[PDB]
Amino acid sequence: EWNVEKFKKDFEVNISSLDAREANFDLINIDTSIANAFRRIMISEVPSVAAEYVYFFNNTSVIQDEVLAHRIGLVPLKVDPDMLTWVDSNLPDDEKFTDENTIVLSLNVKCTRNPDAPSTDPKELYNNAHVYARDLKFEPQGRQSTTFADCPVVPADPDILLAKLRPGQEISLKAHCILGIGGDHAKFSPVSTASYRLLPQINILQPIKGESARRFQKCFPPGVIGIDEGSDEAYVKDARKDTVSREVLRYEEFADKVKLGRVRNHFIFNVESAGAMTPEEIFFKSVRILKNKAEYLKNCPITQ
Amino acid sequence: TGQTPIVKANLYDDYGMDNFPNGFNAVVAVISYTGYDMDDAMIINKSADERGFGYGTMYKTEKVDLALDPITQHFGFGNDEWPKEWLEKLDEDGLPYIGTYVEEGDPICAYFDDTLNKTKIKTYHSSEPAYIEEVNLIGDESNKFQELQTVSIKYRIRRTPQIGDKFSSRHGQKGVCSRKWPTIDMPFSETGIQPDIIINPHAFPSRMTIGMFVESLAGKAGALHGIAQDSTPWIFNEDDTPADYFGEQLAKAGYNYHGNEPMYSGATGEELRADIYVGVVY
Amino acid sequence: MIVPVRCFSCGKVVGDKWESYLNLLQEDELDEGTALSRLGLKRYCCRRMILTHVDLIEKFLRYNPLEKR
């Protein structure tokens, strides 16, 4: 038998590291059917912000138009979600891109010649030769132009390379960024890499104490296999640092003395946000969308 | 997105194919998990081509010659009545704009005849829509002034990599794409990466392409430490197996000696039976 | 040709680390592997983006038909 209180007095979570971008928190005593659901939503069904529609005016550079629009779409923006709702696709463009949903950024650059003593880099030989990410000037319009004063829309990676120009070339574009789920397109995935592994339960079966243990600590990572002295035990220090590689399996001496197992309830989460949010808020919103997904089916009538 | 092969012959650098990159590298795992691919087929991650995986374009040049000897067909318009709504592509000079979207049945060049006093539009009928990138003007040289009568226009077609394209490697395993699966329904490794490409492991007992296995060891062993291992066949022997030499590098890098990385299924979310084979290939 | 941003497999930004990679290989006499480690490339899915890029776009811009020579 299983109930909500039987799981509440059983489910805990630990933390291995706490960073502004990375995160490693270990879910303890939870089922795979829920772990993969959290991992699924954090990548497929979490809203983000990315450039959807791009309007160009003149591009005489070598890199063509659709590729430039694709690149300026790929570059992320350090803008916080929940400050702008979803657009309606069936509406026309003029009634689709309002101020509550659409954020407009512009890019204007005109390279020119700079006299200098000549192998010469384009920074000295030319002016405005390279186009970086910080050149994307965010422009606020509509009814709210002060709600982004303390939160200026800026690409989360200001050093992203966009294109290399030469004198005579000019680029002038006005692009719009919109929301989206990770399942719709790759640019709308605010998480770099989110997955989960299992705790390798290294169960020792025989008294491997001795010089054999000296050849055990070298195979596994250093912070895994430990001993009090040369004898009287051969234990494991930390079962999270190890790697499931079965390298001890290809040894005639260590073939059957130990088995690499698995824990059906010990999971770890490694989430690296793309800058739009924190690796913790991305988890609160992911489980919130899952709870709201259950709310939509709970409060809904049946048909036929 | 053409990239240099990590496992390249010593002669690949002699001619300098780095100037003209043919293909690129991609993480490939010999798995049957998908099922849609069988005995020839191949899959591509949805997020892979969503970011420019194997992107490519075409370039179709057209040569238009006017006036099928007083010349009567001149590029441009005249003076009498003519319908509007086709000025988005053509200019007042009789040439199309550089960059407009031109699908099948669009004006490329309009000509004004004097024998009929009408501006007829030479249509454009082809397979796929194209973007104009450059328009050349050509006029025969002579002691007397001669108006231009030959225009050379060059197109470009955004060929997004879809399924059914004969994707392959440098070992002779020609295949096609069955369906592009999403990343969340794609098996993920212990690190968290999802192999964007999965080739059928059942074609190896028949195709007998062991090269995509040993080179897959050298590919991952080269990407981990940065150093590139030259292929240059007929340098090893049975005493020194390349799977052993490429295996020891993975053993001291963290991976196993067999080059098999344990992964998890994306759909159900469980650990697979045994260690599965991964790696990058050109 | 151009530096691929948002590596296909992982999804991490790659475009910013190209100029820094060349700087580590020019001013510090630093090798290949340690460069990608200090530059912030852990997973081999994304290491093979900077480690393998060709950067042909510089060779493209050597022919400018909009200016003499």
């Binding site: 590291s17 | 968290g192 430490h225 022997n237 890098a253 963290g254 | -």
Partner: peptide, 21 residues
Amino acid sequence: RKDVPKVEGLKLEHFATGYDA
């Protein structure tokens, strides 16, 4: 015959991605 030139100065960068050292 020369068997193979082995790499020199190798290290590890691998699992436990929540802390390197």
